[PDB]
């Protein structure tokens, strides 16, 4: 079992600010990390796959990078539509796990 953690657990930012979320794996996961965004009352939406690949339809303001145990998710410029809980998920091995979730 791989344990996942995220930091900060919650952050305060305004529109136009740069937002960064750190995901850390208790185990080396190379580039097998997914990033999800969840709005209240809705199922999670995938934004980034394989650590740094953007999903089709995802705004260019979203990005991410990293490998091994330390991964970063970034919003180059926070929009009013970007208020959600962000999760990282590893699929290097089973069982799959999600992080605690970061509140933006």
């Amino acid at each position: 079992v791989i344990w996942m953690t995220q930091s900060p657990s919650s952050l305060s930012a305004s529109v136009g600010d740069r937002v960064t979320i750190t995901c850390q794996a208790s185990q080396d996961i190379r580039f097998y990390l997914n990033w999800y965004q969840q709005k209240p009352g809705k199922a999670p939406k995938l934004l980034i796959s394989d650590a740094s690949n953007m999903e089709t339809g995802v705004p260019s303001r979203f990005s991410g990078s990293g490998s091994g145990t330390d991964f970063t998710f970034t919003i180059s410029s926070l929009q009013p539509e970007d208020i959600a809980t962000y999760y990282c998920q590893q699929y290097d091995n089973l069982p799959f796990t999600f992080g605690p979730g970061t509140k933006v």
Binding site: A43, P44, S49, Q89, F96, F98, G99, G101
Partner: protein, 120 residues
């Protein structure tokens, strides 16, 4: 359009059992593996179980020994049989097809709406 529809939720007593189902349409259900994920009020996303496309190999999370995952590819339906339910199992249960380059090979990410299960 691609849809995943959960049903079979409701309220049960501790020690009881409940069978959930997810009807799939709009995609080649029988070529993909499937996952169950649950989320309790106030908490994050918790992975529960995974089954391969052929209904052969099965994997489980906290639920191993109590929950069983199965599927019927002739009906495009995914099932989760939960026995010996506890208060801690209160959650919204989702069926999903998670993008996975290592095991299932899915190139697309799909989620249902979720069904609420209460144990009390």
């Amino acid at each position: 359009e691609v849809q995943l529809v959960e049903s079979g939720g409701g309220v049960v007593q501790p020690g009881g059992s409940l069978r959930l189902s997810c009807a799939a349409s709009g995609f080649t259900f029988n070529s993909y593996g499937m996952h169950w994920v649950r989320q309790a009020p106030g908490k994050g996303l918790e992975w529960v179980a995974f089954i391969r496309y052929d209904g052969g190999n099965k994997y489980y999370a906290s639920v191993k020994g109590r929950f069983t995952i199965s599927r019927d590819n002739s009906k495009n339906t995914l099932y989760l049989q939960m026995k010996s339910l506890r208060a801690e199992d209160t959650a919204v249960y989702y069926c999903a097809n998670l993008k996975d380059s290592r095991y299932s090979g899915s190139y697309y990410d799909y989620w249902g709406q979720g069904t609420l299960v209460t144990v009390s």
